[PDB]
């Protein structure tokens with residue numbers, strides 16, 4: 352059924368699985384109109400679909416044109432997400448299709464189940480983990496491609512860069528979630544940590560800087576401090 | 589007016605006939621039920637004093653034959669049988685009536701309750717849901733499962749209700765996933781009404797028969813079927829006006845007749861609250877909403 356602390360290592364076994372996060376699909380700014388009413392203006396979004404074992408990120412960019420003339424957009428966004436995930440699975444060879452899809456919000460369960468009725472062997476699961484994937488738009492290169500898009504577009508990334516050369520997928524996922532948790536709790540502090548040292552660069556084909564093993568330990572420690580100590584400034588402890 | 593004679597009542601049992609019921613003591617001089625209104629299906633049902641577990645009974649229509657009840661001491665239940673010798677049957681019933689050994693079906697003259705509960709229920713459709721073509725009457729009990737229940741184990745003993753499943757390819761057209769899941773009109777009107785049931789009278793008949801089995805026998809799969817058939821209508825934005833008006837009347841009498849004391853186990857809080865207050869038809873069931881709010885405001 353659901354996915355939580357007790358069955359965490361299942362993420363890194365050899366059954367293909369994908370996480371789907373829809374929290375950045377429908378994005379708006381809220382502003383005042385000339386008449387003094389309030390109105391939204393949508394901006395580009397993205398579906399975050401990640402294989403946690405390989406790091407393969409299927410970033411479907413949601414262009415604002417897909418909302419034109421539509422009503423009840425928050426509800427539509429969940430079905431559009433489900434339609435796009437279903438289209439992705441159909442585009443993959445059978446041996447690359449997931450055996451499970453884990454949605455980060457339970458409201459995606461029924462839209463995805465309906466769109467995947469053709470795949471009764473693919474399990475659609477929620478999770479009790481509070482995963483920080485909404486902070487994906489705090490990764491500069493991902494934000495850049497989403498905002499620059501003028502049409503629907505799928506962009507492929509490895510969100511683990513080359514880390515799996517040196518560490519396991521369990522450790523790679525733990526690092527990713529720590530970085531994203533930090534970016535979600537205090538983006539400016541998190542980014543300052545990541546880029547403070549001008550000599551550690553981000554390779555053109557990567558998302559994160561080229562830290563050595565020792566530097567990653569320092570970074571990971573600094574991110575844990577942030578999450579504990581921003582927790583302090585917000586919560587008087 | 590027709591008659592269902594009993595050979596005898598060897599075991600203490602509560603006997604139901606339609607919405608009526610009465611207690612027969614072990615070896616009491618009971619020889620059946622007389623004055624049964626012609627023109628309606630009927631149900632005669634039983635609950636033994638010694639094992640309230642297992643409520644069972646027979647759907648029948650006196651126009652389709654002469655039927656009687658006889659206890660079987662091997663199988664341990666009151667069984668319905670058909671008497672083919674018409675002279676022997678009239679003779680038997682005449683003697684039992686002359687000795688006043690029969691209870692009278694106690695229909696008050698003002699009272700359209702049974703008609704209103706069985707308006708669309710036909711014996712021929714009952715026999716397609718309860719398969720046992722060798723008899724003209726149909727046996728049902730508390731524990732029989734439905735075809736859909738068996739898909740989620742003896743097929744001869746199942747209730748063959750129409751499978752309704754809102755997350756099925758039958759329910760959902762490719763390319764209309766969101767449309768068809770949030771507005772079930774296609775599934776109601778095209779798949780079920782035009783395709784399977786052919787007309788709304790047959791749909792209402794199965795709905796009414798499911799309610800009555802659920803209510804009389806505590807049959808859980810029937811209860812699921814009754815709610816599913818209500819929810820399909822209430823979750824459709826486009827329903828013929830006459831069907832909504834009739835549904836309101838159907839449900840009204842069902843809610844009126846339900847034992848207050850079993851509402852907690854026969855009424856699904858989620859379905860009723862959704863249907864009356866959230867669905868497309870939330871404003872279309874005036875009589876049902878009024879009786880529900882005045883009789884079971886707890887459930888809501």
Ligand SMILES: N=C(NCCc1cccs1)NC1CC1
Pocket residue numbers: 406407408409507508509
């Ligand atoms: N990083 C890639 N391609 C492989 C990495 C993958 C991520 C997702 C599926 S494969 N980029 C291609 C566009 C140039």
